[PDB]
């Protein structure tokens, strides 16, 4: 059994947005609740709402969320969250979670199964696809049979971007750093990998879903 | 929430 | 609504040691109380429910205890893999009214102190296509180090005080080490007006310095 949230995006203050939680490996039935929990960047967990999974559709909410948020069971495998009146205070990763249970009739009011989250960014800024630049040692440096190369993913909004190397086949020793918000208000992220210089050309594969951007950069072993 | 409270508490 | 006051906000302990986290409830609550482990970029993982019951696969060196208004999580035999932020959670409600829900503590960042390791440092001049955009971003990476470092940038030996961002990976699950990426952003005019670009990474009485000369790249 697993969960996956979708629908996060960049939206303007005052906007509405619907998120979706999709269950795999199970379908909803009596005995537990499905719930949403959010987390603002760098902050803690904050519960939003739950819905009975038993088919009644009964819901209950955090006091702050009443009136702006609605949780629904849209199908036997999907929960939705409709958000309205959004401000910067609602920027957060939104998680779907299934209440755990140790008996067949009801749950134990803790969350045993979680999705990876979907990010909602409430901002007046416009979408911006990143530019990707190779990272390689100075041309004048002495070559080596092993070298650390990388990619700088510069100037995007909103988060996230994803980075893989060689279509996901290169994973050992990859360091993909947390994003940083530059003074321009746009984000940047770097990723590096250490490889054997022979018979090993490395390409970073970058994706920015908010603009439907996919870009590959093959990184030459130096700035030459 | 009241029903859940009745059950658990 | 119940408020959970979780302490400490951050704690450090050696590999093999013990960390203790306390959560105090603003009113008396039931033992429908839980603890979660969250690693950066991941969702929380349930460790304990009903105050002291271990979730499937969680070892007993995670110990939940307490009742009433004060609950405790004790993590012993600490491993580098335990580096994470931990949260308590209360379920609360009323049999009489439509009041209740879930309250989380504010979290505790756990740092696991492994062996001290000095970083190795790499510097990356801006790709040739950066300069025509009007700004360049230079990248410095400090690899595989513990404890935390301080990064200084120099341009022709002068310390930079603006245009710098730093980003640190989570602690490595095998050896507790960090990695760090530091970026210095300048206009193209600034970049082309100077020669030597230096990243200095300091760890107490140790410094590791890496430079490049623009004319050589
Ligand atoms: C009260 O709850 C009963 C038990 O339902 C289980 O627990 C609740 C809290 C939900 O998680 C639900 O999905 C579970 O199946 C229900 O059978 C009963 O109908 C409920 N009564 C009222 C009046 O809501
Ligand atoms: C709580 O367990 C479910 O709450 C459903 C909404 O409240 C029901 C009002 N009768």
Short mmCIF file of C-alpha atoms and ligand atoms in Angstrom, two decimals:
data_model
loop_
_atom_site.label_atom_id
_atom_site.label_comp_id
_atom_site.label_asym_id
_atom_site.label_seq_id
_atom_site.Cartn_x
_atom_site.Cartn_y
_atom_site.Cartn_z
CA UNK A 1 0.00 0.00 0.00
CA UNK A 2 1.21 3.50 -0.84
CA UNK A 3 0.03 7.09 -1.31
CA UNK A 4 1.04 9.80 -3.78
CA UNK A 5 -0.06 13.43 -3.67
CA UNK A 6 -0.42 15.60 -6.75
CA UNK A 7 -1.64 19.05 -7.70
CA UNK A 8 0.88 21.30 -5.97
CA UNK A 9 1.77 24.36 -8.00
CA UNK A 10 2.59 28.04 -7.91
CA UNK A 11 -0.61 30.05 -7.33
CA UNK A 12 -1.36 33.70 -6.63
CA UNK A 13 -2.64 35.05 -3.31
CA UNK A 14 -6.43 34.71 -3.21
CA UNK A 15 -6.36 31.63 -5.47
CA UNK A 16 -8.01 28.24 -5.00
CA UNK A 17 -6.31 24.91 -5.65
CA UNK A 18 -7.28 21.23 -5.47
CA UNK A 19 -4.78 18.59 -4.37
CA UNK A 20 -5.25 14.87 -4.94
CA UNK A 21 -4.03 11.87 -2.94
CA UNK A 22 -3.99 8.59 -4.87
CA UNK A 23 -3.86 5.24 -3.09
CA UNK A 24 -2.05 2.28 -4.64
CA UNK A 25 -2.22 -1.30 -3.41
CA UNK A 26 -5.46 -0.75 -1.49
CA UNK A 27 -8.82 0.95 -1.75
CA UNK A 28 -10.70 2.75 0.99
CA UNK A 29 -12.78 0.80 3.49
CA UNK A 30 -14.08 1.13 7.02
CA UNK A 31 -11.77 1.15 10.04
CA UNK A 32 -9.62 4.29 9.69
CA UNK A 33 -9.44 7.92 8.55
CA UNK A 34 -7.57 9.55 5.66
CA UNK A 35 -6.07 12.92 6.52
CA UNK A 36 -4.02 15.83 5.23
CA UNK A 37 -1.06 17.36 7.08
CA UNK A 38 1.10 20.25 5.89
CA UNK A 39 4.57 21.58 6.61
CA UNK A 40 5.78 25.08 5.77
CA UNK A 41 9.42 25.31 4.62
CA UNK A 42 11.71 24.85 7.60
CA UNK A 43 8.79 24.46 10.03
CA UNK A 44 6.86 21.66 11.76
CA UNK A 45 3.88 19.46 10.95
CA UNK A 46 0.37 20.96 11.05
CA UNK A 47 -2.77 18.83 10.80
CA UNK A 48 -5.50 20.07 8.40
CA UNK A 49 -8.44 17.66 8.19
CA UNK A 50 -9.56 14.03 8.15
CA UNK A 51 -12.32 12.08 6.42
CA UNK A 52 -13.74 8.73 7.47
CA UNK A 53 -12.68 6.04 4.99
CA UNK A 54 -15.83 4.01 5.71
CA UNK A 55 -17.97 5.61 2.98
CA UNK A 56 -19.99 7.96 5.20
CA UNK A 57 -18.00 10.97 4.03
CA UNK A 58 -17.90 12.34 7.58
CA UNK A 59 -15.15 14.96 7.91
CA UNK A 60 -13.52 16.91 10.71
CA UNK A 61 -11.17 19.87 10.58
CA UNK A 62 -8.59 21.91 12.40
CA UNK A 63 -10.17 25.14 13.64
CA UNK A 64 -7.92 27.30 11.47
CA UNK A 65 -8.87 25.30 8.36
CA UNK A 66 -12.67 25.37 8.71
CA UNK A 67 -14.22 27.25 5.82
CA UNK A 68 -11.13 27.46 3.59
CA UNK A 69 -10.32 23.74 3.24
CA UNK A 70 -12.54 20.81 2.24
CA UNK A 71 -11.40 17.16 2.29
CA UNK A 72 -13.30 14.67 0.12
CA UNK A 73 -13.20 11.03 -0.97
CA UNK A 74 -13.48 11.39 -4.75
CA UNK A 75 -13.19 7.65 -5.48
CA UNK A 76 -12.28 4.40 -3.77
CA UNK A 77 -8.63 5.34 -4.42
CA UNK A 78 -8.52 9.16 -4.30
CA UNK A 79 -8.80 11.80 -1.58
CA UNK A 80 -8.89 15.45 -2.55
CA UNK A 81 -8.23 18.67 -0.65
CA UNK A 82 -9.84 21.87 -1.95
CA UNK A 83 -8.05 24.98 -0.67
CA UNK A 84 -9.32 28.56 -1.00
CA UNK A 85 -8.29 32.06 0.02
CA UNK A 86 -4.62 31.17 -0.24
CA UNK A 87 -1.87 33.41 1.15
CA UNK A 88 1.86 33.02 1.77
CA UNK A 89 0.89 31.46 5.12
CA UNK A 90 -0.37 28.44 3.14
CA UNK A 91 2.90 27.82 1.26
CA UNK A 92 3.87 24.33 2.40
CA UNK A 93 4.37 20.73 1.46
CA UNK A 94 1.00 18.99 1.78
CA UNK A 95 1.01 15.31 2.82
CA UNK A 96 -1.74 12.72 2.57
CA UNK A 97 -1.72 10.16 5.37
CA UNK A 98 -3.62 7.03 6.39
CA UNK A 99 -4.48 6.51 10.04
CA UNK A 100 -3.02 3.28 11.40
CA UNK A 101 -5.09 0.65 13.18
CA UNK A 102 -4.46 -2.34 15.45
CA UNK A 103 -8.03 -3.64 15.28
CA UNK A 104 -10.67 -3.95 12.56
CA UNK A 105 -13.22 -1.41 13.80
CA UNK A 106 -11.35 1.93 14.10
CA UNK A 107 -7.86 3.39 14.10
CA UNK A 108 -5.44 4.50 16.80
CA UNK A 109 -5.24 8.20 15.87
CA UNK A 110 -1.69 8.16 14.50
CA UNK A 111 -0.56 8.19 10.89
CA UNK A 112 1.14 5.02 9.68
CA UNK A 113 1.25 5.59 5.90
CA UNK A 114 2.30 8.84 4.21
CA UNK A 115 2.77 10.12 0.69
CA UNK A 116 5.94 11.93 -0.36
CA UNK A 117 4.14 15.29 -0.35
CA UNK A 118 3.24 17.92 -2.94
CA UNK A 119 4.49 21.51 -2.71
CA UNK A 120 2.13 24.50 -2.88
CA UNK A 121 3.74 27.92 -3.41
CA UNK A 122 1.56 31.01 -2.90
CA UNK A 123 3.31 33.94 -4.57
CA UNK A 124 2.74 36.73 -7.06
CA UNK A 125 5.92 35.73 -8.90
CA UNK A 126 5.72 34.28 -12.38
CA UNK A 127 6.81 30.76 -13.35
CA UNK A 128 10.44 30.58 -14.43
CA UNK A 129 12.24 27.59 -15.93
CA UNK A 130 15.85 27.13 -14.77
CA UNK A 131 19.01 27.48 -16.78
CA UNK A 132 21.40 24.55 -16.31
CA UNK A 133 25.16 25.06 -16.37
CA UNK A 134 27.90 22.43 -16.13
CA UNK A 135 30.27 22.36 -13.18
CA UNK A 136 33.80 21.19 -14.02
CA UNK A 137 37.27 22.00 -12.66
CA UNK A 138 39.30 24.83 -14.16
CA UNK A 139 40.74 24.04 -17.60
CA UNK A 140 44.30 24.55 -16.37
CA UNK A 141 44.06 21.94 -13.60
CA UNK A 142 45.94 18.67 -14.02
CA UNK A 143 43.63 15.87 -15.23
CA UNK A 144 42.88 12.86 -13.08
CA UNK A 145 41.49 9.38 -13.67
CA UNK A 146 38.66 10.42 -11.33
CA UNK A 147 36.91 13.78 -11.35
CA UNK A 148 33.95 15.41 -9.63
CA UNK A 149 31.56 17.06 -12.08
CA UNK A 150 28.16 18.59 -11.61
CA UNK A 151 25.31 20.80 -12.71
CA UNK A 152 24.05 24.14 -11.43
CA UNK A 153 20.28 24.50 -11.86
CA UNK A 154 19.91 28.27 -11.64
CA UNK A 155 16.96 30.61 -11.37
CA UNK A 156 13.66 28.73 -11.18
CA UNK A 157 10.25 29.27 -9.60
CA UNK A 158 8.45 27.52 -8.02
CA UNK A 159 10.23 24.61 -6.42
CA UNK A 160 10.86 21.77 -7.03
CA UNK A 161 13.34 20.68 -9.64
CA UNK A 162 14.57 17.11 -9.83
CA UNK A 163 18.03 15.99 -10.94
CA UNK A 164 19.26 12.57 -12.00
CA UNK A 165 22.53 11.49 -13.60
CA UNK A 166 22.82 9.36 -16.75
CA UNK A 167 19.06 8.72 -16.79
CA UNK A 168 19.18 7.44 -13.22
CA UNK A 169 21.88 4.84 -13.89
CA UNK A 170 24.55 6.86 -12.04
CA UNK A 171 23.71 7.10 -8.34
CA UNK A 172 26.81 6.16 -6.34
CA UNK A 173 28.34 9.23 -4.73
CA UNK A 174 25.81 11.74 -6.06
CA UNK A 175 25.37 14.80 -3.84
CA UNK A 176 22.28 16.84 -4.71
CA UNK A 177 22.12 19.80 -2.37
CA UNK A 178 19.01 21.49 -0.97
CA UNK A 179 17.80 24.44 -3.00
CA UNK A 180 18.65 27.99 -1.98
CA UNK A 181 16.56 31.10 -2.60
CA UNK A 182 18.76 33.70 -4.27
CA UNK A 183 18.35 37.44 -3.79
CA UNK A 184 16.47 37.57 -7.10
CA UNK A 185 13.68 35.55 -5.43
CA UNK A 186 14.43 32.61 -7.72
CA UNK A 187 15.77 29.27 -6.54
CA UNK A 188 18.98 27.47 -7.44
CA UNK A 189 20.20 23.95 -6.78
CA UNK A 190 23.43 22.11 -7.50
CA UNK A 191 24.28 18.44 -7.87
CA UNK A 192 27.71 16.83 -8.13
CA UNK A 193 28.98 13.30 -8.80
CA UNK A 194 32.41 11.66 -8.70
CA UNK A 195 33.22 9.39 -11.65
CA UNK A 196 36.14 7.68 -13.33
CA UNK A 197 37.36 10.00 -16.08
CA UNK A 198 37.70 7.17 -18.61
CA UNK A 199 34.83 5.72 -20.65
CA UNK A 200 32.34 7.70 -18.54
CA UNK A 201 30.57 10.74 -20.00
CA UNK A 202 28.07 12.08 -17.45
CA UNK A 203 24.83 13.91 -18.20
CA UNK A 204 22.58 15.57 -15.65
CA UNK A 205 18.85 15.23 -16.36
CA UNK A 206 16.92 18.17 -14.89
CA UNK A 207 13.14 18.54 -14.65
CA UNK A 208 11.04 21.54 -13.60
CA UNK A 209 7.42 20.34 -13.62
CA UNK A 210 5.79 23.77 -13.21
CA UNK A 211 7.03 24.77 -16.69
CA UNK A 212 7.08 21.24 -18.18
CA UNK A 213 10.85 21.68 -18.54
CA UNK A 214 13.17 18.75 -19.14
CA UNK A 215 16.80 19.47 -20.02
CA UNK A 216 19.94 17.35 -20.30
CA UNK A 217 23.46 18.74 -19.93
CA UNK A 218 26.45 16.54 -20.69
CA UNK A 219 29.33 17.81 -18.56
CA UNK A 220 32.77 18.01 -20.14
CA UNK A 221 35.56 17.10 -17.68
CA UNK A 222 36.98 20.65 -17.58
CA UNK A 223 36.24 24.26 -18.50
CA UNK A 224 38.54 23.89 -21.55
CA UNK B 1 -14.75 14.24 15.66
CA UNK B 2 -17.28 13.77 18.48
CA UNK B 3 -18.03 10.21 17.36
CA UNK B 4 -14.32 9.43 17.11
CA UNK B 5 -13.88 10.87 20.60
CA UNK B 6 -16.73 8.72 21.97
CA UNK B 7 -15.08 5.61 20.51
CA UNK B 8 -11.49 6.29 21.55
CA UNK B 9 -12.09 8.21 24.79
CA UNK C 1 -7.22 23.23 21.38
CA UNK C 2 -4.34 21.31 22.91
CA UNK C 3 -0.82 22.70 22.37
CA UNK C 4 2.24 20.42 22.63
CA UNK C 5 5.44 22.08 23.88
CA UNK C 6 8.33 19.94 22.63
CA UNK C 7 11.88 20.32 23.96
CA UNK C 8 14.72 20.62 23.18
CA UNK C 9 14.53 22.26 19.74
CA UNK C 10 17.88 20.65 18.89
CA UNK C 11 20.17 18.11 20.52
CA UNK C 12 23.50 16.49 19.70
CA UNK C 13 24.78 13.15 21.00
CA UNK C 14 27.58 10.78 20.08
CA UNK C 15 27.18 7.61 18.06
CA UNK C 16 26.14 4.97 20.57
CA UNK C 17 24.67 7.59 22.89
CA UNK C 18 21.20 8.58 23.99
CA UNK C 19 18.85 11.44 23.16
CA UNK C 20 15.73 12.30 25.18
CA UNK C 21 12.83 14.43 23.89
CA UNK C 22 10.00 15.74 26.10
CA UNK C 23 6.50 16.87 25.11
CA UNK C 24 4.26 18.75 27.53
CA UNK C 25 0.54 19.07 26.85
CA UNK C 26 -1.35 22.26 27.71
CA UNK C 27 -4.14 20.10 29.18
CA UNK C 28 -4.48 16.50 30.33
CA UNK C 29 -4.59 14.19 27.30
CA UNK C 30 -5.11 10.49 26.67
CA UNK C 31 -2.42 7.99 25.70
CA UNK C 32 -3.42 8.16 22.01
CA UNK C 33 0.00 9.76 21.61
CA UNK C 34 2.55 9.15 18.88
CA UNK C 35 6.11 9.91 17.79
CA UNK C 36 7.48 10.40 14.29
CA UNK C 37 10.90 10.51 12.63
CA UNK C 38 11.34 12.80 9.62
CA UNK C 39 14.43 12.90 7.46
CA UNK C 40 14.93 15.88 5.12
CA UNK C 41 12.90 15.64 1.94
CA UNK C 42 10.96 12.63 3.21
CA UNK C 43 7.55 12.30 4.85
CA UNK C 44 7.38 11.53 8.57
CA UNK C 45 7.70 7.90 9.66
CA UNK C 46 5.59 6.61 12.54
CA UNK C 47 7.77 5.26 15.36
CA UNK C 48 5.39 4.82 18.31
CA UNK C 49 1.63 4.96 18.82
CA UNK C 50 -0.58 4.60 21.90
CA UNK C 51 2.28 6.32 23.81
CA UNK C 52 4.59 3.30 23.95
CA UNK C 53 3.77 0.72 21.24
CA UNK C 54 6.41 0.27 18.54
CA UNK C 55 5.30 0.52 14.93
CA UNK C 56 6.19 -2.42 12.71
CA UNK C 57 9.94 -2.83 12.26
CA UNK C 58 10.94 -0.07 14.71
CA UNK C 59 13.58 -1.32 17.20
CA UNK C 60 13.06 -1.08 20.95
CA UNK C 61 15.93 1.40 21.34
CA UNK C 62 13.15 3.86 20.48
CA UNK C 63 11.22 4.06 23.74
CA UNK C 64 8.04 6.09 24.25
CA UNK C 65 6.89 6.73 27.81
CA UNK C 66 4.80 9.08 29.93
CA UNK C 67 1.13 9.93 30.38
CA UNK C 68 -1.12 12.75 31.53
CA UNK C 69 0.51 15.99 30.46
CA UNK C 70 4.10 14.83 29.89
CA UNK C 71 5.39 12.30 27.36
CA UNK C 72 8.96 11.29 26.55
CA UNK C 73 10.88 9.67 23.69
CA UNK C 74 14.23 8.06 24.52
CA UNK C 75 16.50 7.05 21.62
CA UNK C 76 19.42 4.90 22.72
CA UNK C 77 22.28 3.19 20.87
CA UNK C 78 22.19 6.19 18.55
CA UNK C 79 23.24 5.61 14.92
CA UNK C 80 24.17 8.02 12.14
CA UNK C 81 20.97 6.79 10.44
CA UNK C 82 18.96 8.34 13.31
CA UNK C 83 19.86 11.89 12.24
CA UNK C 84 16.44 13.43 11.66
CA UNK C 85 13.78 15.74 13.07
CA UNK C 86 11.39 14.04 15.50
CA UNK C 87 7.83 15.09 16.36
CA UNK C 88 5.34 14.17 19.04
CA UNK C 89 1.62 14.13 18.32
CA UNK C 90 -1.48 14.16 20.55
CA UNK C 91 -4.95 13.11 19.54
CA UNK C 92 -7.47 14.95 21.70
CA UNK C 93 -11.21 15.38 21.74
CA UNK C 94 -14.41 15.75 23.70
CA UNK C 95 -17.23 13.23 24.09
CA UNK C 96 -19.62 16.18 24.55
CA UNK C 97 -18.83 18.55 21.68
CA UNK C 98 -17.45 18.83 18.15
CA UNK C 99 -13.99 19.73 19.44
CA UNK C 100 -10.73 17.88 18.89
CA UNK C 101 -8.12 16.77 16.44
CA UNK C 102 -4.35 16.36 16.19
CA UNK C 103 -1.65 18.55 17.75
CA UNK C 104 2.05 18.20 16.88
CA UNK C 105 5.02 19.28 18.90
CA UNK C 106 7.34 21.76 17.24
CA UNK C 107 10.01 19.16 16.51
CA UNK C 108 13.51 18.27 17.72
CA UNK C 109 16.47 18.23 15.35
CA UNK C 110 18.81 15.37 16.31
CA UNK C 111 22.47 15.68 15.30
CA UNK C 112 24.53 12.50 15.65
CA UNK C 113 28.17 13.19 16.49
CA UNK C 114 30.47 10.81 14.63
CA UNK C 115 34.21 11.02 14.05
CA UNK C 116 35.63 14.46 13.19
CA UNK C 117 36.56 14.64 9.49
CA UNK C 118 38.16 17.55 7.65
CA UNK C 119 36.52 18.48 4.34
CA UNK C 120 38.02 18.26 0.93
CA UNK C 121 37.11 21.31 -1.12
CA UNK C 122 36.35 21.75 -4.83
CA UNK C 123 35.80 25.01 -6.71
CA UNK C 124 33.95 25.30 -10.02
CA UNK C 125 34.47 28.33 -12.29
CA UNK C 126 31.34 29.52 -14.11
CA UNK C 127 30.59 27.63 -17.30
CA UNK C 128 31.61 29.56 -20.40
CA UNK C 129 27.98 30.35 -21.24
CA UNK C 130 27.24 32.00 -17.87
CA UNK C 131 29.15 35.24 -18.44
CA UNK C 132 27.10 36.37 -21.46
CA UNK C 133 23.96 36.39 -19.28
CA UNK C 134 25.31 39.31 -17.22
CA UNK C 135 25.83 37.38 -13.98
CA UNK C 136 28.04 34.47 -13.00
CA UNK C 137 27.63 31.98 -10.16
CA UNK C 138 30.77 30.27 -8.84
CA UNK C 139 30.27 27.03 -6.89
CA UNK C 140 32.39 25.68 -4.04
CA UNK C 141 31.76 22.26 -2.48
CA UNK C 142 33.03 21.03 0.89
CA UNK C 143 32.83 17.24 0.85
CA UNK C 144 32.46 14.71 3.65
CA UNK C 145 33.10 16.64 6.85
CA UNK C 146 32.15 16.82 10.53
CA UNK C 147 31.57 19.04 12.52
CA UNK C 148 30.12 22.13 10.80
CA UNK C 149 32.36 24.42 8.79
CA UNK C 150 32.46 28.14 8.06
CA UNK C 151 32.80 29.23 4.42
CA UNK C 152 34.60 32.42 3.35
CA UNK C 153 34.83 33.67 -0.23
CA UNK C 154 37.65 35.88 -1.45
CA UNK C 155 37.98 37.78 -4.72
CA UNK C 156 41.58 38.87 -5.23
CA UNK C 157 42.06 38.18 -1.53
CA UNK C 158 39.16 40.41 -0.39
CA UNK C 159 36.47 38.72 1.69
CA UNK C 160 33.02 38.84 0.08
CA UNK C 161 30.08 39.89 2.25
CA UNK C 162 27.14 39.58 -0.17
CA UNK C 163 25.91 37.36 -2.97
CA UNK C 164 26.61 34.12 -1.08
CA UNK C 165 24.26 31.21 -0.38
CA UNK C 166 25.07 27.98 1.45
CA UNK C 167 23.30 24.63 1.36
CA UNK C 168 24.11 21.56 3.47
CA UNK C 169 23.14 17.93 2.86
CA UNK C 170 21.68 15.76 5.62
CA UNK C 171 24.14 13.78 7.70
CA UNK C 172 25.41 10.67 5.92
CA UNK C 173 23.71 7.54 7.22
CA UNK C 174 26.98 5.56 7.45
CA UNK C 175 29.51 8.09 8.80
CA UNK C 176 27.48 11.13 10.00
CA UNK C 177 29.31 13.54 7.65
CA UNK C 178 27.87 16.57 5.87
CA UNK C 179 28.50 18.01 2.45
CA UNK C 180 28.05 21.67 1.65
CA UNK C 181 27.59 23.74 -1.50
CA UNK C 182 28.39 27.45 -1.41
CA UNK C 183 27.62 29.81 -4.28
CA UNK C 184 29.01 33.29 -4.96
CA UNK C 185 27.14 35.37 -7.53
CA UNK C 186 28.68 38.43 -9.21
CA UNK C 187 27.91 40.53 -12.23
CA UNK C 188 29.85 39.66 -15.37
CA UNK C 189 31.66 43.00 -15.10
CA UNK C 190 32.80 42.16 -11.56
CA UNK C 191 33.89 38.68 -12.61
CA UNK C 192 35.89 39.94 -15.59
CA UNK C 193 37.50 42.68 -13.42
CA UNK C 194 39.29 40.29 -11.02
CA UNK C 195 41.69 37.36 -11.29
CA UNK C 196 41.65 35.00 -8.30
CA UNK C 197 38.56 33.38 -6.81
CA UNK C 198 38.94 31.56 -3.50
CA UNK C 199 36.75 29.37 -1.32
CA UNK C 200 38.07 29.00 2.25
CA UNK C 201 36.48 26.34 4.46
CA UNK C 202 37.28 26.55 8.16
CA UNK C 203 36.73 23.94 10.86
CA UNK C 204 38.15 25.25 14.12
CA UNK C 205 41.94 25.29 13.79
CA UNK C 206 41.81 23.66 10.32
CA UNK C 207 41.34 25.47 7.01
CA UNK C 208 41.09 23.99 3.52
CA UNK C 209 41.41 26.51 0.70
CA UNK C 210 40.76 26.11 -3.01
CA UNK C 211 41.21 28.82 -5.64
CA UNK C 212 41.23 29.30 -9.36
CA UNK C 213 42.60 32.03 -11.60
CA UNK C 214 40.02 33.23 -14.12
CA UNK C 215 42.62 33.62 -16.88
CA UNK C 216 43.56 29.94 -16.55
CA UNK C 217 40.06 28.54 -17.04
C1 LIG D 1 -18.87 6.39 14.50
O1 LIG D 1 -17.72 5.69 14.08
C2 LIG D 1 -17.96 4.32 13.80
C3 LIG D 1 -16.64 3.61 13.61
O2 LIG D 1 -16.09 3.98 12.37
C4 LIG D 1 -14.65 3.87 12.37
O3 LIG D 1 -14.07 4.90 13.13
C5 LIG D 1 -14.37 6.22 12.68
C6 LIG D 1 -13.76 7.18 13.69
C7 LIG D 1 -13.85 6.41 11.26
O4 LIG D 1 -12.45 6.25 11.21
C8 LIG D 1 -14.47 5.36 10.33
O5 LIG D 1 -13.94 5.45 9.02
C9 LIG D 1 -14.17 3.97 10.91
O6 LIG D 1 -14.79 2.94 10.18
C10 LIG D 1 -18.89 4.24 12.59
O7 LIG D 1 -19.19 2.90 12.26
C11 LIG D 1 -20.19 4.96 12.90
O8 LIG D 1 -21.04 5.02 11.79
C12 LIG D 1 -19.90 6.39 13.37
N1 LIG D 1 -21.09 7.08 13.81
C13 LIG D 1 -21.35 8.38 13.54
C14 LIG D 1 -22.65 8.90 14.13
O9 LIG D 1 -20.61 9.09 12.87
C1 LIG D 2 -16.09 13.01 14.03
O1 LIG D 2 -15.74 11.94 14.44
C2 LIG D 2 -16.90 13.12 12.73
O2 LIG D 2 -17.47 14.40 12.61
C3 LIG D 2 -18.33 14.52 11.51
C4 LIG D 2 -18.94 15.92 11.48
O3 LIG D 2 -19.67 16.12 12.66
C5 LIG D 2 -20.85 15.40 12.72
C6 LIG D 2 -21.94 16.34 13.24
N1 LIG D 2 -23.06 15.54 13.71
#
